[PDB]
Amino acid sequence: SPFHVMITSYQLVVSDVAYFQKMKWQYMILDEAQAIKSSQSSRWKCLLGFHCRNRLLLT
DNA sequence: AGTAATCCCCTTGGCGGTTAAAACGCGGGGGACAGCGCGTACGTGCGTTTAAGCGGTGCTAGAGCTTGCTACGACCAATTGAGCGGCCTCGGCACCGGGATTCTCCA
């Protein structure tokens, strides 16, 4: 495959959300998950909805 | 709930070059423009007659207004697929080159 892991910004996942939906992930890292701590944040609402089989938070 | 940092995006600005488009020079041609003569075609004046304008009489079509209701569109909630945003590709149109046909101008 042309990739195994994909690195991206907390900014792009909310901006390109319509492309991030329509995709399915085997594993996900959130690399400094204190970015997610506001449940009112769009980056909480969006990354929550990413179809991912197992998820990990780093903090 | 507020105000500031963070980050995307998209517009403005600068630098280099390259070359295609703008500027410049110069001869000559022919088109703009003033000048002339004529002649016919438009403005003038008169006598003619024609009907537009006014004051007046008569009628009825139909503009304008009210009454009464029911047929038709406004409004809402649930359903779904027609239409939009994103990705792909291949074929139409351009772009080039080269030889063939046309048109232009001086002889």
Name the helix (H) or strand (E) containing A47.
helix A42-48
- A8 CA vs B65 C1’ separation (Å): 76
Write down the experimental method used for this entry: cryo-EM
Resolution (A): 2.7
- A43 CA vs B100 C1’ separation (Å): 70
Whole-angstrom Cα distance, residue A34 to residue A54? 19
Beta-carbon count within 10 A of A43 CB: 16
In strand B, which positions have an atom below 7 A from any protein CB? Answer: 7-9, 86-87
Closest CA to A21 of A43, A51, A44, A41: A51
Sequence-distant (≥ 6) Cβ neighbours of residue A13 within 8 angstroms = A20, A43, A46, A47, A50
